[PDB]
UniProtKB/Swiss-Prot annotation, chain B:
Organism the protein comes from: Homo sapiens (Human)
Annotated protein name in UniProt: Prolyl 4-hydroxylase subunit alpha-2
Tissues expressed in: Expressed in the heart, placenta, lung and pancreas.
Assembly: Heterotetramer of two alpha-2 chains and two beta chains (P4HB) (the beta chain is the multi-functional PDI), where P4HB plays the role of a structural subunit; this tetramer catalyzes the formation of 4-hydroxyproline in collagen.
TPR repeats: 45-78
Family: Belongs to the P4HA family.
Role summary: Catalyzes the post-translational formation of 4-hydroxyproline in -Xaa-Pro-Gly- sequences in collagens and other proteins.
Localization (cell): Endoplasmic reticulum lumen
Disulfide cross-links: none
Disease link: Myopia 25, autosomal dominant: A refractive error of the eye, in which parallel rays from a distant object come to focus in front of the retina, vision being better for near objects than for far.
């Protein structure tokens, strides 16, 4: 969905 | 007191549990101790990566934008951060 992405871990 | 890197590890632990509120508490403390000149292997850009996303999850929209801009300022080739910046600027009409 439309949004930011944080660190994978 | 815990060290800068200890607090960063605490913030990452909280984040990996999906606990965004505790991520903010720890990462804000990291930034304070970095600004106080404390030695650390962790860099401000890494802290801002966790913190910007966590404050967004908690609903703090213009702060998430501000921290995302700061993140990119310190790490311009961070592609995910650039994508986040485009998202927040379009979301908040701050392009």
């Amino acid at each position: 969905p439309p949004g930011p992405a944080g660190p994978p871990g | 007191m815990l060290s800068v890197d200890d607090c960063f590890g605490m913030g990452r632990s909280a984040y990996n549990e999906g606990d965004y509120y505790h991520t903010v508490l720890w990462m804000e403390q990291v930034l304070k101790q970095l600004d106080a000149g404390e030695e650390a292997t962790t860099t401000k850009s890494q802290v801002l990566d966790y913190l910007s996303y966590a404050v967004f999850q908690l609903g703090d929209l213009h702060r998430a934008l501000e921290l995302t801009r700061r993140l990119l300022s310190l790490d311009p080739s961070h592609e995910r951060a650039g994508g986040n910046l485009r998202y927040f600027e379009q979301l908040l009409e701050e392009e």
